[PDB]
Design a protein around this motif. Structure first.
Motif, PDB file in Angstrom:
ATOM      1  N   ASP A  35       7.265 -10.209  -5.529  1.00  0.00           N
ATOM      2  CA  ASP A  35       8.596  -9.646  -5.625  1.00  0.00           C
ATOM      3  C   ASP A  35       9.674 -10.746  -5.447  1.00  0.00           C
ATOM      4  O   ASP A  35      10.651 -10.797  -6.214  1.00  0.00           O
ATOM      5  CB  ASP A  35       8.755  -8.529  -4.588  1.00  0.00           C
ATOM      6  CG  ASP A  35       8.274  -7.167  -5.067  1.00  0.00           C
ATOM      7  OD1 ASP A  35       8.067  -7.006  -6.296  1.00  0.00           O
ATOM      8  OD2 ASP A  35       8.098  -6.260  -4.215  1.00  0.00           O
TER       9      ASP A  35
ATOM     10  N   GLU B  30      15.318   0.988  -1.806  1.00  0.00           N
ATOM     11  CA  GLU B  30      14.189   1.575  -1.111  1.00  0.00           C
ATOM     12  C   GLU B  30      12.929   0.761  -1.295  1.00  0.00           C
ATOM     13  O   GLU B  30      12.137   0.673  -0.367  1.00  0.00           O
ATOM     14  CB  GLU B  30      13.949   3.002  -1.617  1.00  0.00           C
ATOM     15  CG  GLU B  30      15.097   3.952  -1.314  1.00  0.00           C
ATOM     16  CD  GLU B  30      15.112   5.232  -2.130  1.00  0.00           C
ATOM     17  OE1 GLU B  30      14.321   5.335  -3.097  1.00  0.00           O
ATOM     18  OE2 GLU B  30      15.930   6.127  -1.810  1.00  0.00           O
ATOM     19  N   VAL B  31      12.725   0.177  -2.487  1.00  0.00           N
ATOM     20  CA  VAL B  31      11.529  -0.589  -2.801  1.00  0.00           C
ATOM     21  C   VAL B  31      11.630  -2.082  -2.439  1.00  0.00           C
ATOM     22  O   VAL B  31      10.679  -2.632  -1.882  1.00  0.00           O
ATOM     23  CB  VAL B  31      11.153  -0.375  -4.291  1.00  0.00           C
ATOM     24  CG1 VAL B  31       9.964  -1.235  -4.703  1.00  0.00           C
ATOM     25  CG2 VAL B  31      10.862   1.093  -4.567  1.00  0.00           C
TER      26      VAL B  31
END
Ligand SMILES: COCC(=O)NCc1nc2ccccc2[nH]1
Ligand SMILES: COCC(=O)NCc1nc2ccccc2[nH]1
Lengths: 245, 179
Positions: A35, B30-31
């Motif tokens: 991420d 949220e992620v």
């Protein structure tokens, strides 16, 4: 930007970009590392895009539609070609690294395990010298570019109509001339934040933790060097004002 | 709409990037919480006036004294941030951040913002701080510091729960509109 790269980086994170059946196969620590790596690439894509707005939309549009005194357009967009070259090459390497890591039969499922090596190469040798020299020049010419922009907008009707016209579309809302200049200046100081957070989730392979630690020290050395080489230029500054700094 | 520029200043531990992200995002992260903030132009309507508020962060510029001031030109409102879980970040406000902001932004309103107000009643936060003879920043301590530095006002918020976030930015727009 090109549609292919935009769709690849459209999701808010790598965990939302990959297929959920592919995500389910990886450990939490790999997902966290991926991420943050995805954020570095996504923001590099946006940064290269900012430089293309400056060269193609603003700079070229002024050269092709306006009658400005020679050297005015250069004063407004200093080193934009050199910057676009450095960052388009860096973005090409980041995107090629993602592409090589794709699963066969997929255009979105990948894992980048070896970012450190690419970051050490970008922030060392000739490429580091060119970023140091280009950002020292850019950031020293930053205030002059904003003052020159403000003068032209207030005193030139055709320049004011050009700006309003080319910045009217909604996709340009946060990309005016002054916004693009500060977006470029702020870019180099985002690198240590992204790299330190990637390092935080890269202790699994010791060679990778070491490469990322070296890259972090290299970026910090570059920033310290750029910071030390900055001296704001002022249009019409007198020598006496300069040597009494 | 008129265009105004806001810049948030303060220590890295004050959560300034988190506050800008949570205000601008539209649906809370949220992620994944982004590491950095680029820029944003907020469409705000305060007291019947429509303003485009450009938002900027100084995160990553704290150790670079000659790069950092390039964020300051033509700022209309300064958000001076500190964390309620860090009395050390409040102590850095009067003689580190305030003299810099008054030199590069004379006559620009400063709003002193106490972030992470949810940690004022957090037991892990209270335990960790007690080990260094400290406690979470009290409301009067925040108000007194805002008074001392000549701030336009004092406000508190929590980027984690969103409480008080909208009110900070609407007030910052009102401050940027004043003569
Ligand atoms: C509802 O969210 C659950 C989840 O899985 N989020 C992904 C995720 N969590 C991260 C923490 C640190 C760095 C990067 C991260 N990415
Ligand atoms: C570089 O720092 C700026 C930033 O926003 N980093 C991500 C981030 N900040 C968080 C705060 C609380 C919980 C989770 C978080 N994740």
């Amino acid at each position: 930007s090109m549609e292919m790269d935009e769709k690849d980086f459209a999701a808010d994170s790598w965990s939302l970009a990959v297929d959920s059946s592919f995500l389910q196969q990886h450990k939490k620590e790999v997902m966290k590392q991926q991420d943050v790596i995805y954020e570095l690439i996504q923001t590099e894509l946006h940064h290269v895009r900012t430089l293309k707005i400056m060269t193609r939309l603003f700079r070229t549009g002024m050269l092709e539609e306006l009658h400005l005194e020679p050297g005015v357009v250069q004063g407004l967009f200093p080193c934009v070609d050199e910057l676009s070259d450095i960052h388009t090459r860096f973005l090409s390497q980041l995107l090629e690294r993602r592409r090589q890591a794709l699963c066969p039969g997929s255009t979105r499922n990948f894992v980048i395990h070896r970012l450190g090596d690419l970051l050490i190469s970008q922030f060392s040798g000739p490429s580091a010298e060119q970023m140091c020299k280009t950002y020292s020049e850019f950031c020293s010419r930053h205030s002059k570019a904003l003052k020159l922009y403000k003068e032209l907008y207030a005193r030139d009707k055709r320049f004011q109509q050009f700006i309003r016209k080319v910045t009217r579309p909604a996709v340009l809302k946060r990309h005016g001339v002054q916004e693009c200049i500060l977006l470029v200046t702020q870019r180099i100081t985002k690198y240590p934040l992204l790299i330190s957070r990637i390092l935080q989730h890269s202790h699994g392979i010791e060679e990778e933790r070491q490469d990322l630690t070296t890259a972090l020290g290299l970026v910090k050395e570059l920033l310290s060097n750029v910071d030390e080489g900055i001296y704001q230029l002022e249009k019409g500054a007198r020598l006496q004002e300069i040597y009494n700094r | 709409a008129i265009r105004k520029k806001l810049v948030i200043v303060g220590d890295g531990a004050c959560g300034k990037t988190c506050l800008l992200i949570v205000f601008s995002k539209d649906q809370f992260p949220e992620v994944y919480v982004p590491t950095v903030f680029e820029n944003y132009v907020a469409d705000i309507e305060v007291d019947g006036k429509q303003v485009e508020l450009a938002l900027w962060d100084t995160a990553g510029q704290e150790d670079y004294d000659r790069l950092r001031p390039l964020s300051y030109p033509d700022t209309d409102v300064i958000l001076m941030c500190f964390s309620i879980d860090s009395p050390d970040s409040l102590e850095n406000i009067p003689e580190k951040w305030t003299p810099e902001v008054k030199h590069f932004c004379p006559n620009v309103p400063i709003i002193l913002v106490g972030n992470k107000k949810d940690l004022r009643n957090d037991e892990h936060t209270r335990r960790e701080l007690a080990k260094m003879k400290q406690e979470p920043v009290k409301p009067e301590e925040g108000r007194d510091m805002a008074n001392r530095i000549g701030a336009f006002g004092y406000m508190e918020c929590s980027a984690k729960t969103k409480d008080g976030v909208r009110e900070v930015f609407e007030m910052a727009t009102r401050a940027a509109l004043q003569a």
